[PDB]
Amino acid sequence: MIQRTPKIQVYSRHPAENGKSNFLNCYVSGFHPSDIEVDLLKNGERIEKVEHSDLSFSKDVSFYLLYYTEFTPTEKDEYACRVNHVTLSQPKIVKWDRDM
Numbered sequence: 001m002i003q004r005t006p007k008i009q010v011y012s013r014h015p016a017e018n019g020k021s022n023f024l025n026c027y028v029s030g031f032h033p034s035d036i037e038v039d040l041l042k043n044g045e046r047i048e049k050v051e052h053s054d055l056s057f058s059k060d061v062s063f064y065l066l067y068y069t070e071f072t073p074t075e076k077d078e079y080a081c082r083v084n085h086v087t088l089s090q091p092k093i094v095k096w097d098r099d100m
Contacts, residue, residue, distance in 0.1 A: 036085050052069060078096075
């Protein structure tokens with residue numbers, strides 16, 4: 001058996017095709033086993049509508065998840081990514097840096 005805790009990166013992107021649409025992303029990478037729970041949070045509450053959730057694996061059987069959806073941030077609102085995995089005794093919360 002092997003277990004590897006995920007790396008988590010939280011950032012925003014505009015698709016080049018549509019510079020008017022901003023997207024909040026969580027890239028949860030390098031994890032094993034594959035069982036996992038991943039949420040986007042807005043002011044600490046789980047975001048229900050997340051349009052994209054893309055899973056893949058590598059040769060060494062690590063898993064990779066890109067979890068992202070359209071958003072319109074304002075200064076007042078705080079966003080995070082909340083991850084639960086077997087390797088984590090508590091849910092891991094990573095805040096979005098609004099400059100990223």
